[PDB]
Amino acid sequence: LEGVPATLSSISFVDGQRGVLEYRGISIEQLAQQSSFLETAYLLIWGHLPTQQELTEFEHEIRYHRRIKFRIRDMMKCFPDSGHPMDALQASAAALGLFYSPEYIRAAVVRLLAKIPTMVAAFQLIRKGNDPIQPRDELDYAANFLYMLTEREPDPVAARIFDICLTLHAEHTINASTFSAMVTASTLTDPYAVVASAVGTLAGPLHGGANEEVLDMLEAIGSVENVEPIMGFGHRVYKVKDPRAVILQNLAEQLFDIFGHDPYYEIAVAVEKAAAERLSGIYPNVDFYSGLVYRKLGIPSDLFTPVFAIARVAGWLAHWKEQLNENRIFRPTQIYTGSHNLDYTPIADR
Amino acid sequence: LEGVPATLSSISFVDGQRGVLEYRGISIEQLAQQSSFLETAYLLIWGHLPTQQELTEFEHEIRYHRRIKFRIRDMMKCFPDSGHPMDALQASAAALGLFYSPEYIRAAVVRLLAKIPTMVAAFQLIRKGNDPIQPRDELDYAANFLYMLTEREPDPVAARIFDICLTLHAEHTINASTFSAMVTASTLTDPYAVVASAVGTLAGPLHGGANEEVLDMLEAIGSVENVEPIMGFGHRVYKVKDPRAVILQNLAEQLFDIFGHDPYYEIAVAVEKAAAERLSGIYPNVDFYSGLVYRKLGIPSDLFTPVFAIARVAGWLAHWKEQLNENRIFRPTQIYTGSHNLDYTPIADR
Amino acid sequence: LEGVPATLSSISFVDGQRGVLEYRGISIEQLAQQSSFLETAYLLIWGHLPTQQELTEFEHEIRYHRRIKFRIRDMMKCFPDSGHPMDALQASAAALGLFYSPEYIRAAVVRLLAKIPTMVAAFQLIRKGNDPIQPRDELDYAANFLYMLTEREPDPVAARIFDICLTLHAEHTINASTFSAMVTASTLTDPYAVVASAVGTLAGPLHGGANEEVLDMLEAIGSVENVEPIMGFGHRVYKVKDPRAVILQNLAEQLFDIFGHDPYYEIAVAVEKAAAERLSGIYPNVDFYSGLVYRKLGIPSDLFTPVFAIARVAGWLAHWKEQLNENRIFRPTQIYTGSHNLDYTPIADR
Amino acid sequence: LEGVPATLSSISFVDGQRGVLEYRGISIEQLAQQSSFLETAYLLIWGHLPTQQELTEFEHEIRYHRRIKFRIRDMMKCFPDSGHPMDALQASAAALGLFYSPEYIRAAVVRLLAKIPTMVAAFQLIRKGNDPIQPRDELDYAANFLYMLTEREPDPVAARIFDICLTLHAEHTINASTFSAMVTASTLTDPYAVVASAVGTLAGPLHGGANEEVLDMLEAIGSVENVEPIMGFGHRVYKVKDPRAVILQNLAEQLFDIFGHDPYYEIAVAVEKAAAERLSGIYPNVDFYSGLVYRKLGIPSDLFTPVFAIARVAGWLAHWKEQLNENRIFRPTQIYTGSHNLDYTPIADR
Amino acid sequence: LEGVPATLSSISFVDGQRGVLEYRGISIEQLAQQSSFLETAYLLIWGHLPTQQELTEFEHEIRYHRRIKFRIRDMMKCFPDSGHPMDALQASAAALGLFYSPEYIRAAVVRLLAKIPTMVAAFQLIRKGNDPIQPRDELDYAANFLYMLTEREPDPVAARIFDICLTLHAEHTINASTFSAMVTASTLTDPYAVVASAVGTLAGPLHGGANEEVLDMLEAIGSVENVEPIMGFGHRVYKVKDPRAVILQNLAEQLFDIFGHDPYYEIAVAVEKAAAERLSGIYPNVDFYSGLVYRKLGIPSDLFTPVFAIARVAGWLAHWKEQLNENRIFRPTQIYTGSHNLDYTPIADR
């Protein structure tokens, strides 16, 4: 289906031959320097920058809905401990519609945005046999998520780095997950089912992406002298450089300089400086620095993809709201490549 | 059975032709101005005003027993979400006897008084899918109940208004609920069964009283210009004015002036000033101002009757303790108005 | 309140100076010989003998509703194991209104009649740590209750004896429990609250009656030679003989002759033959033979009163239905025997 | 402690230089041919062969107590799915004392014997996410255990083989588990604690014995042509042949001839016929044939040791009952091989 | 088995003819004056006094693991309320192996030491129907245990007295419980099974020791004038005086002088001053003062033995670690005192 202009969207723009990525016409650097995750999500979903009162009301509503019912936690207590976090995320997103399914757009958006990280952290805590940690009203989005994940209040620098990372991964362009979200939404269904379908599509093979395989190769190297004696490089769109990659690398460098270097960072630098001298087109992408940034913040490996989903919910929701107005069922045609006009044969004659 | 002096009680006195209401000989105005709910309950149950040490010990014992066992909360978790609060209150009062049934009078009184509002608030929170809020030892009776109901610490003015309202509704006179309580207590049964029977009697039709129908009429009017273009007025005892009504109206006026006016207050004033000019005998009663006072404090509509029950437990308990000493089973006689000396007819012959 | 004709009822007639007991004008002997419990309950509630089709439909509806929801069983699983069966019965009757509260009279009657013994047996099984036994559609009322209580299908003779015992204890006359039921029902409340109030009244002191104290005296005697070297005799109404007592004694004699004599029966005969020679007025009542009949059927001691309640639900319900049509709140008057016109005294001045 | 005659027991006799094993003086062949597991357990515990009435009463009491409370099953539902069956067995044996701890000896024996296999099968079913299967009164000990384990009623031949295997493994002689059982019982403690201590001792390294390593070697060989191109042979007591081994081999041969040969049996025969020609002293023991017999009956590998424990409970209990009469705390002496008369040193000086 | 030097241990030394008790060669007075419980446990298990960094790391690791999983608390919620604390302790110790069974020695030691008092307090709270109190990171071992037991933060003096008491009862010498622990550990099993076996052995008769019978006699006397008008005196090892008894008496005197005298202390002094004048050899032991010290701290009577177990876990663990290196199964020999060479008799011929 590649190459078919099946959608008319004014949400994001991507130029691979120039390294340009824009959210609603605003470059990603502007949002990565002078914007947060919630304001970027408001810009994506509603199409315009919120005012002061709108931003404060949005943040208050999101902070008020960060707590989940005790029935949802009880449901998570019945999840098997060996299940993957993506399956649990899909199950919880589908279960949100058992409870919460003009003002319908705004309420659903704020509930989903407030509650998705809460359930992710709750399942992370429950899987190891611990009790889920309740959200705190004093903290903000990224800081509260980090506290819920690690039981400890994070440094403001780490919270800012995580917020900018979420903004970078908020949305890129049309893809399999977004296409599935729009296909589900074309039937005028509740956004919780759309989110569940998008998460199921995003799970992919092995319930993970190329964010952990980079760490696997890095551990396989195991030293800064085995890099010289491939996943984590290249891209299918951009040809000069991924514009998110430079910001991610700068954030990783700043966070590691402030919080002290680690050996895996050293092996990453050793491999990347060698790869930039013999393969450069081939350039590193966000899949290389995202793993390092997430691991330095204390995020487990198998929770890399769910965190990505936490960033992507704002994108999906945006594409949902658009689709709505353009109500049109995805009903493509097919060509038959089989046999014709044969008859049923008795079972005894087979 | 109306008109039969079936009880000899020295607890309360009511004079409808003079507008007099007295608790143990003390006028309701004195208690509404210079007394709290717990001291009034002590006066009602024990017949005399407590001293300083007695009052402090009573308050300490009540504050210590405000917490319910986790089995009771687990039982509430199994209650259907569509059940009425009165049925849940009766079930919880009956379940208290599964656990806690000279020193027997005092322990039962303090446990019931401490725990009834706790279970009311716990069911209110559980019904909506939230976790019950634990009581705080720093707050007092009314303030702790309001915090448990609304998750937020109330203003001291609101707590005082609620305490005076509870004192006003603590006890009025013999009625159906009190008669049922005395009938149950005449068999020398535990006070928890008496409280459950009294709550079941108090539930009445539609599991509610005339406190919500006033709000229904007020919403039906919907404006301050539709009052001119009936429940909430009149009484069956008093002919001049309900002495509790004037205090309730003063409290409502003070609370609304301090906390800002509301449109429903405006419609209430518009309807009452018109009704006092063409119907005055017909006068407003406590059922008119109680709904407004409770709604301004954040109390839901369907929890009006349970809150009334919270006020009435002190009265019932008092009537229980009295009845005890006067041990006499309510064994009235009957007259037969049916057929006599007929025989059984075979089923095939019917 | 004794001696006041407060009720006009055509349900039952009692003549103590002639030993006459009639249900709706039909003598108790006719119903005890040629009637069952369900047909007698239909006669009591509806006032006339049911036809064939009506009786079959009533039995089918009762048999269909004998199964309780899993939420009720879960609630019983949270009951403390040391609680008394009467408190659990009251709690379950109150909880039935959380779920099931022209056709309203009939549905409530059949649900209560079908489900009360089911919950009694379920609590009996749960209290000892066993799982409740589900009802069987092949058995009838008494046989199914006995199977649920003892896990074993009873002999048809035992089932018939239990059915006749239930018919005998179905209703006697106005008393404390029935008066409380009518007082609760006068407010036009649901029958589940009426049943809960009646059970609470019937619990009485020590959560039991004089049915177990007879066994206590019999065990204290401990032999057929210690009767010569009082609870279980006399009555407050009848002067010649209790007409239910002769039928109960005949049933006990028949059941014990068919199923073999027991030592406690021998001590009962020894004490009764001595008491009938020196005290005869003083005559044995149903409280003497009911304990023996229930114990021979395998019913535990502390479940004597609940079984009585199972018999009495038909009576209460009947009195409920009558009361309804005669809607009149029990609002008696009182006389004040206390002090007048005293004032509040400061706490520091006490 | 080897070589010290610390116990005087008349329960079992073992002669390794003659291949003699006797239970209370009766050879193991007599019991393996003309006795069952329950009668052998009665002989071991009570010292004499039961009569007809005693045997029937023992079997009836054991069959009546085969059902466990729902609280125990609920406790098993909280066990982690990754836990080993031996830890769960120890936990359940310890939990039995939370409930059931002249007639005390007999009741404890029958409860333990009836309930241990029930909990083993219940944990086996729960661990895989299935519901436990309730026991059937129609089946006997071994057949009911096999039905509970595999949901299917076993062939009578298989049940007989399993019963004879249980009789063979009922008891051998004093060892670590029996010594721990007697040490625990010397303090006059309940038999449930003794059973829990014995199970904990029997768990050993890796929570298993040499019964699964034989299957590991057999699978490693993987063919009947790789035996020629060691666990499962030899013993520390017998020098001619294990008298239980010949019976176990005969039972395995009969069961496999009746139920059809399997490839692992073929590899077992190939390895044993080669080992009996070049190593014969070195002879196979019960650890070789027990695994094959258990696997052919459908018993999982990791449940080999618990089944052994099911056989051994009769032995332990016997040694418990004996110990009782000979009340003497195991209080051995020790010799000090450390430093003397040194003093405490400040932490800052270390 | 008394008198057999079955063990070679350099952990503790006891001299009864001189009143000497040493942990690893260091006298008990030095540790009771200038040491805590955790440092003494480190000395016992590892054989040398920890340094500053080692002590801080040990305390940090113990404080981090003081919290138990929610599955363990759920398992305790299923324990019967009438069960004894020792059975619950054994069940919880066995259940710890369902979850947590070079670095293996240290992790197991810290988990057991951190979690045993937590589960003891959790069962104490659950048994009465209250929720378990979570540990606080600000408090230390004894203070946190006292807070968890009594919901109130203890005075530092009381915490110090409790810590010294735990140090005194940490370990005495080889006995039945330690012998059972070594017998279980000789099979190279996990330390959780060893702890469960040791607890089962320590439960003893009536699930308690002679620490509560002293209080029983003291209450039987009931006055300071009935001592003149035996458990709690004497010992089986020491002949001059128990060296722990003098420290325990000094601690009790100091704690009671600081916190005010109690009548039971007065009766204890009256009985001990009379017993020291007519029986002195006969001297009081730790069983006399331990009950008083524990009761003054708010510890219930039936939890005396579990608290002792909390002290003894360090000893058992030490003996476990030693045993390990000296791997040798306790396989004693026996002498047969029964019949020989008899045959099986048909059941019909018995």
Residue numbers in the entry:
A (entry chain D), B (entry chain C), C (entry chain E), D (entry chain B), E (entry chain A): 11 to 111, 118 to 245, 257 to 307, 310 to 379
What does the primary publication say about this deposited structure?
Here we report the discovery of a natural protein, citrate synthase from the cyanobacterium Synechococcus elongatus, which self-assembles into Sierpiński triangles. Bacterial citrate synthase (CS) proteins are homo-oligomeric enzymes that can assemble into dimers and hexamers. CS catalyses the condensation of acetyl-CoA and oxaloacetate to citrate as the first step in the tricarboxylic acid cycle. Using cryo-electron microscopy, we reveal how the fractal assembles from a hexameric building block.
An interaction between the residue E6 from one monomer and H369 of the other establishes an important contact, and mutating either E6 or H369 to alanine or deleting amino acids 2–6 (Δ2–6 SeCS) abolishes the formation of fractals. To understand how this interface forms, we compared the geometry of a variant that could only assemble into hexamers (Δ2–6 SeCS) to that of a hexamer within the 18mer. We extracted a hexamer from the 18mer structure, aligned its free corner dimer onto one dimer of Δ2–6 SeCS and then compared the positions of the two unaligned dimers between the structures. This analysis revealed that the two dimers engaging in fractal connections undergo a small clockwise rotation relative to their conformation within a free hexamer, which subtly breaks the D3 symmetry of the hexameric building block within the fractal. Comparing this structure to the one of a free hexamer (Δ2–6 SeCS) revealed that the CS dimers within the hexamer undergo an anticlockwise rotation after binding to citrate. This rigid-body rotation is well known from other CS enzymes. It takes place following substrate binding and pushes CS from an open conformation (which corresponds to the conformation in the Δ2–6 SeCS structure) into a closed form in which catalysis takes place.
